[PDB]
Amino acid sequence: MSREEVESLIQEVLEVYPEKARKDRNKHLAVNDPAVTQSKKCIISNKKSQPGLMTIRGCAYAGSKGVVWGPIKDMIHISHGPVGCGQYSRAGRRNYYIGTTGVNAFVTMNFTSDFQEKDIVFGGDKKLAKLIDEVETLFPLNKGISVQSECPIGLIGDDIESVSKVKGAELSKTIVPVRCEGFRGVSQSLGHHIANDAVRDWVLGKRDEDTTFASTPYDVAIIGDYNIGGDAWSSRILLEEMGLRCVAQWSGDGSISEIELTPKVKLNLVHCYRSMNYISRHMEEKYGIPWMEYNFFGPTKTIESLRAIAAKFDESIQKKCEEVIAKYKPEWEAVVAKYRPRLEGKRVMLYIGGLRPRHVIGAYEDLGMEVVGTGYEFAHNDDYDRTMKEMGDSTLLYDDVTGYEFEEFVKRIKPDLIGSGIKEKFIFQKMGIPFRQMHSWDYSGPYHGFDGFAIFARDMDMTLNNPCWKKLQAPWE
Amino acid sequence: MSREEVESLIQEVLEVYPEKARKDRNKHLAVNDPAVTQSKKCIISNKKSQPGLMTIRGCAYAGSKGVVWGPIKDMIHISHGPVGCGQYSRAGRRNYYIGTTGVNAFVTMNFTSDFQEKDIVFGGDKKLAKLIDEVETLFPLNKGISVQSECPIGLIGDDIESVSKVKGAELSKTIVPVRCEGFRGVSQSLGHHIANDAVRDWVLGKRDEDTTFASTPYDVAIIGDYNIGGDAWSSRILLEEMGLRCVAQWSGDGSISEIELTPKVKLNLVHCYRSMNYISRHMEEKYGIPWMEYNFFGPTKTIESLRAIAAKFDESIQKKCEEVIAKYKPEWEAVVAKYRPRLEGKRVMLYIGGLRPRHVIGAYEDLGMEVVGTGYEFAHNDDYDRTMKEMGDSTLLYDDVTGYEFEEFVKRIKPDLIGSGIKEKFIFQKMGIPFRQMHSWDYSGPYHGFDGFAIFARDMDMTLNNPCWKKLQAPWE
Amino acid sequence: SQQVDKIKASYPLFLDQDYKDMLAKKRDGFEEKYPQDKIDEVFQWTTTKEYQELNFQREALTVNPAKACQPLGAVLCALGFEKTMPYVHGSQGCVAYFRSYFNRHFREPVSCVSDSMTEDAAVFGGQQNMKDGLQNCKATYKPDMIAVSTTCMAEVIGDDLNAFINNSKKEGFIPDEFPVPFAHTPSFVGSHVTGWDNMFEGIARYFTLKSMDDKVVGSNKKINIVPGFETYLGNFRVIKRMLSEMGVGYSLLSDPEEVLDTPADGQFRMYAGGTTQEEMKDAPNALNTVLLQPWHLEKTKKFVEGTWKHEVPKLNIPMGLDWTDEFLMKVSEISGQPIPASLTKERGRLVDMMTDSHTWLHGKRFALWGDPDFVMGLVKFLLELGCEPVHILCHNGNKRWKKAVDAILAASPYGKNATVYIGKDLWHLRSLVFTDKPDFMIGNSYGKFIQRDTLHKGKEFEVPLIRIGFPIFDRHHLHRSTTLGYEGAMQILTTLVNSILERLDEETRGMQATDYNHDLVR
Amino acid sequence: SQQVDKIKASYPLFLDQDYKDMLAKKRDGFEEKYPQDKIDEVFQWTTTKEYQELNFQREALTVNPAKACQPLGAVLCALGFEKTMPYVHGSQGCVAYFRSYFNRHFREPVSCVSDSMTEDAAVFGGQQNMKDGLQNCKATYKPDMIAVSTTCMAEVIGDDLNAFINNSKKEGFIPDEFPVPFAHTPSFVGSHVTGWDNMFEGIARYFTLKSMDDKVVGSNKKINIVPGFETYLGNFRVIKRMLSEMGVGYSLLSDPEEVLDTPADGQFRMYAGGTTQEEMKDAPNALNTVLLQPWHLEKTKKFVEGTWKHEVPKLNIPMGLDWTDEFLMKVSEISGQPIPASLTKERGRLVDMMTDSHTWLHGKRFALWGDPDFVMGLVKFLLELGCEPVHILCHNGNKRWKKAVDAILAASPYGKNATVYIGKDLWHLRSLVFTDKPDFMIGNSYGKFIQRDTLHKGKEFEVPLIRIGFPIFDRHHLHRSTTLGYEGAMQILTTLVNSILERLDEETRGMQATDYNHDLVR
Numbered sequence A, B: 001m002s003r004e005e006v007e008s009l010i011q012e013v014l015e016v017y018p019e020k021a022r023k024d025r026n027k028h029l030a031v032n033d034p035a036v037t038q039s040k041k042c043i044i045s046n047k048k049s050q051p052g053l054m055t056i057r058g059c060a061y062a063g064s065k066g067v068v069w070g071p072i073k074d075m076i077h078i079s080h081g082p083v084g085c086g087q088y089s090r091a092g093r094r095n096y097y098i099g100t101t102g103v104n105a106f107v108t109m110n111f112t113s114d115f116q117e118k119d120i121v122f123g124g125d126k127k128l129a130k131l132i133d134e135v136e137t138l139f140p141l142n143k144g145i146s147v148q149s150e151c152p153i154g155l156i157g158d159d160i161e162s163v164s165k166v167k168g169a170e171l172s173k174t175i176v177p178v179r180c181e182g183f184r185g186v187s188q189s190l191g192h193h194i195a196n197d198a199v200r201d202w203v204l205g206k207r208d209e210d211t212t213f214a215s216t217p218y219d220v221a222i223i224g225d226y227n228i229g230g231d232a233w234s235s236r237i238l239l240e241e242m243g244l245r246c247v248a249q250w251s252g253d254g255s256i257s258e259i260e261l262t263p264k265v266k267l268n269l270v271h272c273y274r275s276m277n278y279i280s281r282h283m284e285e286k287y288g289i290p291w292m293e294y295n296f297f298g299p300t301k302t303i304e305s306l307r308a309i310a311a312k313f314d315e316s317i318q319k320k321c322e323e324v325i326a327k328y329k330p331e332w333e334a335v336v337a338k339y340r341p342r343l344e345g346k347r348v349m350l351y352i353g354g355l356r357p358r359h360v361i362g363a364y365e366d367l368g369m370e371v372v373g374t375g376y377e378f379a380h381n382d383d384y385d386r387t388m389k390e391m392g393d394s395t396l397l398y399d400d401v402t403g404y405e406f407e408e409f410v411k412r413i414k415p416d417l418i419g420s421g422i423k424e425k426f427i428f429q430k431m432g433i434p435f436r437q438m439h440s441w442d443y444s445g446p447y448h449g450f451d452g453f454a455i456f457a458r459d460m461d462m463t464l465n466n467p468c469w470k471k472l473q474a475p476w477e
Numbered sequence C, D: 001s002q003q004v005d006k007i008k009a010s011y012p013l014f015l016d017q018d019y020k021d022m023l024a025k026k027r028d029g030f031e032e033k034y035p036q037d038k039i040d041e042v043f044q045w046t047t048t049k050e051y052q053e054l055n056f057q058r059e060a061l062t063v064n065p066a067k068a069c070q071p072l073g074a075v076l077c078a079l080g081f082e083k084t085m086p087y088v089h090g091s092q093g094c095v096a097y098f099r100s101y102f103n104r105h106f107r108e109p110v111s112c113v114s115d116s117m118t119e120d121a122a123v124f125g126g127q128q129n130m131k132d133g134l135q136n137c138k139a140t141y142k143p144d145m146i147a148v149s150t151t152c153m154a155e156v157i158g159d160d161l162n163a164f165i166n167n168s169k170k171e172g173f174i175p176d177e178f179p180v181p182f183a184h185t186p187s188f189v190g191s192h193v194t195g196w197d198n199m200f201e202g203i204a205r206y207f208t209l210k211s212m213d214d215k216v217v218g219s220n221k222k223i224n225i226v227p228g229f230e231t232y233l234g235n236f237r238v239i240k241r242m243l244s245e246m247g248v249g250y251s252l253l254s255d256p257e258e259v260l261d262t263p264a265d266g267q268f269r270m271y272a273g274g275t276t277q278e279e280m281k282d283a284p285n286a287l288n289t290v291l292l293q294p295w296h297l298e299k300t301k302k303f304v305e306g307t308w309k310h311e312v313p314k315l316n317i318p319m320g321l322d323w324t325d326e327f328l329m330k331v332s333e334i335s336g337q338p339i340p341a342s343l344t345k346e347r348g349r350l351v352d353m354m355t356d357s358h359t360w361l362h363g364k365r366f367a368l369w370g371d372p373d374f375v376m377g378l379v380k381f382l383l384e385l386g387c388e389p390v391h392i393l394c395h396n397g398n399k400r401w402k403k404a405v406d407a408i409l410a411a412s413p414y415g416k417n418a419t420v421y422i423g424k425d426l427w428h429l430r431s432l433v434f435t436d437k438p439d440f441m442i443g444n445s446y447g448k449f450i451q452r453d454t455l456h457k458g459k460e461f462e463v464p465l466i467r468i469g470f471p472i473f474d475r476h477h478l479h480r481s482t483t484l485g486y487e488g489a490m491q492i493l494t495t496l497v498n499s500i501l502e503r504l505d506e507e508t509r510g511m512q513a514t515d516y517n518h519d520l521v522r
């Protein structure tokens, strides 16, 4: 489609809306021009969702509890408030870890204060203090507690900070109050920021006066990899084969100690910019630790990232870098040789959260595929600035896309594959469009790194080329 | 029911038959009088079945391959002829064993010569010789082969004895020809006899000149226990706790060597009279080994049997006998205390093969139950002689009962439980009568010995008293 | 590394030696992990009666609940109406979760909107969100009805749904006669099933309260059927099938079976099937109203009895033999239709199956959980099968319900070793299956973690999960199954007996060790 | 010993130490058993390619066949006719086995008589057995039809069924008008399916050969349906259901679904349901005759084509998506009835399930066996699911059938690694699943022993059995299932994907070892 055709598509779709919604949505839909560097000339983002339009977004609790805190394996995270939020988010996100669940690790469990009417009317702080004692009795090997606030907590004027200070002192335990109530912000995004600030304020400084950790010149942290299906492990392996020492993973398979040790590293390696840029900036400000963005999706990006990381160290790491690249060359070349001819020329539309809608484009291109539309639930304009150079001219961009818009865009564009989430999957399959989940990896992965690219390629092919797709039309019409 | 009522029941039932059948069947149906000791005044048995009347009987191959030979675990038994017989009888009978199946033991496997038209037309002896070589190659740890003849073998004039002699000499292997074709005799019974004679003629004399076996005064063999659900093991244990040494089990969990060692024992303990009286007689005649009948169904019979067996040995065995009886007293007493109040006064009709229709009566009586009718598929008059003193006055006896007869008898008598086989089970359940399989133990057991009685009691109770039986009548009818 | 011909996903990739070594180095270098001996010691302690006692003394902490929140149930109820959009007034994060939770269970689209209230609404309330949200929803998604419930923010702030909807109509944001039934659905009261009751009663009120003067009980010759919160397609289907076979005129009120099972034929259908507005308007003219899940339809019952004047029968959920019999006999009485030969035969086939399978079911011990009516029906059928329902857990159950279940247990000798637990969660249940080990669990996917825990103690302590309930996320298409009626009983019986036999086969598969009992025929 | 409140059956009784010691003593004293190292050595050898080569060179020995004999199929065919007694002329031992084999699969009574020929009949033949047998059977069991087949003794002696039955009528043993259709069913030709074909063709001849003069093709506006040897009740039921939904007049010729599923209501029903004599007599007036399982209906086909002058269509068994589509389109063409919305929607629901489950099915490798039509339909549907049917075994298959399956494999890239085997047995299959290990077996209960064997090599080598076929003796009520049509495809899909997910859960259940991948949601 031409720029003019895509502009026309946008206007046609926007016709359904009442005027206020129409005027708003027009600002969140754009035709890419990779020549633009300031996305604030092209698209608005990180604003409220319009009521009644079926946004795909979540809330700040999802961004804090679901995304940042929940993966930390040896802490207990309390979903503080009524029963729903913790139950719907129990083990929905595949933030993988090694541990003994219910004993030393707690990630897939749902701990909650299960607010009842009396808790709303009189406050939950007394219940929270009692709950903490019960956690300590029944889960003695927990290494810290977080309190993930749900909507009612701030609305009723509870003081979880006081409870966390008093109980944390009483028990000589890190207890972290997190004001991630879902009424705050507009999406998962503010939850990330809130969560980062809570790590800063209650965990990260614990070892500021401790000189016992033996650092090396090659110490790094992986910042913003939540280890979906093992993604952080298939990243870590490469960094360490390159000669680095990965002191911490934030927060996939993460432990409280490795978070506390992170101020000792030489370089912070940021994968998810959106979720963790906050604490990365803090660590630069406070500890002098530099940070850099990288991308481990597909061989082209992974090779570029390894080289750019290695360049921050000495010749010995740059030599190991080239050894790693040489080792994996035949492996990813074999993946491309098998799958690229099966996928060449195929067109994909994506819709994901705050990173992947741009970050995975290179991996598609390594299989000869074309990303013809992309967009984000909750990205900010700094994300869009990074996107416009990664997407082709005249491709479609959508911020906080409505259900209606996504369906109508897909009907016109007729992509060969869609990559989005669980609420989207079954819609598009019924339309006869191959769909891959690009949050959960459709229960597959990892997709990061060289080993992840093999699985990514296998997966795109198994679904795009599946025999089921030729069968939706009954042969009698 | 009175004697006259049972007599007029028999007459009413027989009115459906054409004259020839009516006259025959009249001879096979009787009202017990326990005062009689010559059953040949009372009932005819071991005759042909009348055509078209739905006998429950099998054939001589069932009695040889299925019953006597099949259980012998370290031999390979060939179902020689077309594919049906070996397939229907594959692992149908729960003759338990310890072994590595397909390697050193072969019981639940189906080896066949799978006769085709050319084999019928030109004979199967060349195929049999080739089959033997193939068995030797693929199953090198087999310790002998039997050839279980199916209907066509004798009809077409094959000479399996020559093949067995020639191949046995060539291979220095025991290969046993068994002329158990289903056209022979009238039932499973002649199969037992044929099988016993084949053991005599081809296996039992191997060690006649071998004096190396370390014999003791306490050596016995269990003759005619096929270890259904482990029945022979729960018998053996008691015999050995009593200080005896069980050199052989014929043939449940039986090995070829233990069969060959049997002529070295001091006493043959016969459980199944019908199937193995023949070889027991031969062993007394040839080797001077005495034999005695016993009964391990229920505590009363088991205690009587242990005492009667011990009385054949010295004071040390008699003393151990009383120790055994004292050991198990509290165990069976607890079983009675729990289950007899659940079963007292309940009436049972049985129909089984050649032993159990009399042998289990004592066990039922140990639970307060009454056997009001019994009968056999293929018993002889010597079995009926042993039955009439075990059954009550004016009870019903049926030899080779027809399906029609069994149904009509049950409709009038209205037993609380029926104990019979798989072809009977589902008929009686639909009539709302609790049913227990008394061949396969309904996939339960063992039933022999003290440990077996506990399971027998549990089983009769779980079925007779099951809540399902109150539910057959819809509440609107 | 990967071999292109046999690519490994996370399992078993991370078992490769290089990944194993890397993970050991991570642990040792940076995780400051408790020693394995201490982990084992603590695990062992969590399996004990001493731990169970501390566990059952909890007052403030909930761990691994077996319930969800009200608006989830309101959304399901709403989905069952023709061309109806579920709309949850309040916070949008909730709607992302409700949709996803159902998407994962049904493997279908789940359509629901929010009006995206934010922190700013704490000052003034959510009135403008309701005005724009209703207008936007109607224009964009073209529903014929919008069924409104609430998230907990809206309840805490105290938004008056009725007034806000009235003002939306007054000011022209949606037409005066466009149906906008509503219910307050606070997540801190009851559970998801309560939300269903509240939503249904709101819809019932909307269509009937003001129009009662022309209504005559029995005049339409039908029976209304209210299914409650129901997540098996087969359950809506079997009820309609049985009533149709009997020639009974009926109206199923809330019927999502079409919208939760659209064909993949090249188009997306946002709406399909459902109870019509005409059916809801005409419902007071029925002979009567039958509640399939009465233990979460208490508000609905008061409205139907108080306003429609229907003499709602005292019927249990139609699960198992006796309660399906009772349901059919009562429907026959009300409708005047005899129970037909087809259903009599189906009943007899179930009884046949019971007689065929009783020996393997007898005395088998189960732990089980779920919503109150499902649980009590499962208990009843287990007793009919000669099974022992020893741990009966209903997190969202109440004292009156528990008394009813205890009375059912009392009417059978198979109830003698059973206890009913209300307000307890799956962490409580975990202790019970260690300290008083049953043969099997019957429950939802969250039970898999209990099975996992039990295996870790040892194979001889493992309690296998049989998946019946909601949500079931780790198997495919079990939502097509049936648990009600004779068909449901047949399905449950079959699943139970074969789970028993599968486990027995596993235990007897060991060559020359336990395979003496590896029978071909069972 | 036993403890009265927890009685042990054989498993685990014989694991008690006293029984273990006793069994060790028995072995050591008297069994002269091969040393365990030698047993282990030989077992290992039986898993090798070298052993496989020797195994595949067999010419004379068959081990663990996957077929039965002709009269078994004649009996099942006969059961499908109203008030019809199966009667097998020959040896009674055979009838005990046929009845028990079916009793164990259906868990139902199976009525069949013999005429109890003995050795004496070799001199003189079985004529008198037939005379008394027919008279006795008619009098005692009051069938309206007796359908006669043969055991191998009768075939070898050369008894002329036709003459014997004619002489039975001539001499007054049964009325001249009483129907006694017959077929010769030698166990040494073909298999059980051949017996079905022979029996059916004999019944068809009996009712039609001599009365063709008044017949006009299409005059009754129906389609005849011949199911062949079929042991899933769901398969008779689904075909009738689909044809009824389409408004197609039909006659299902041999329909045992009622007699194999009578209710447990306090009476035994020897006969129930079945194809009527009137339906067989009128069958030449149909538009056409459709064979559901053509690869074992070749004799039937020649009769229907040659005598009834029906243009039997070239249709595969209606299994999977494509072949169900083809069946329905052909039935539409013949009948003039359009395919109804209900079936179009059902099709789309199957396709939806395929889209939902494809990622777990993709590339999964299967060994499978059974009868020829069932096997080819299973292969086809596996290809449609993106699965690889790598070992395809049909003991009773023929060369022409193999060519047809090889062509189906060629039409799909998912057939690339597949081989079809005819004449080979489950001992051959055992080697294949060691040397070229698939993910699962799909087969009958005899497969359990192969799974046992594979586990003994090691857990990583275990090939789980998925039970689909005949006979299934070690699970309850699977005979109620469906494999034909969209309903059958939905059932098979569900069973396959959940078998995959059950195994994955087992492999990922290990605490801190493999449970990183023990996902709640799949």
Ligand code: ICS
Pocket: A063, A067, A093, A188, A226, A228, A272, A274, A275, A352, A353, A354, A355, A356, A357, A438, A439, A440
């Ligand atoms: S954290 Fe973010 S929505 Fe950066 S909230 Fe979301 S596991 Fe997405 S595009 Mo789910 S900003 Fe991670 C994300 Fe990306 S949960 Fe995962 S897939 S890379």
Ligand code: ICS
Pocket: B063, B067, B093, B188, B226, B228, B272, B273, B274, B275, B352, B353, B354, B355, B356, B357, B438, B439, B440
């Ligand atoms: S051998 Fe006989 S029919 Fe004595 S052929 Fe039969 S395992 Fe029966 S009453 Mo099945 S003379 Fe044994 C018997 Fe009894 S197979 Fe078993 S139960 S005690």
Ligand SMILES: [Cl-]
Pocket: A101, A108, A109, C449
């Ligand atoms: Cl968990």
Ligand SMILES: [Cl-]
Pocket: B101, B108, B109, D449
């Ligand atoms: Cl075997």
Ligand SMILES: [Fe+2]
Pocket: A426, C106, C107, C108, D352, D353, D356
């Ligand atoms: Fe779906």
Ligand SMILES: [Fe+2]
Pocket: B426, C352, C353, C356, D106, D107, D108
């Ligand atoms: Fe049955």
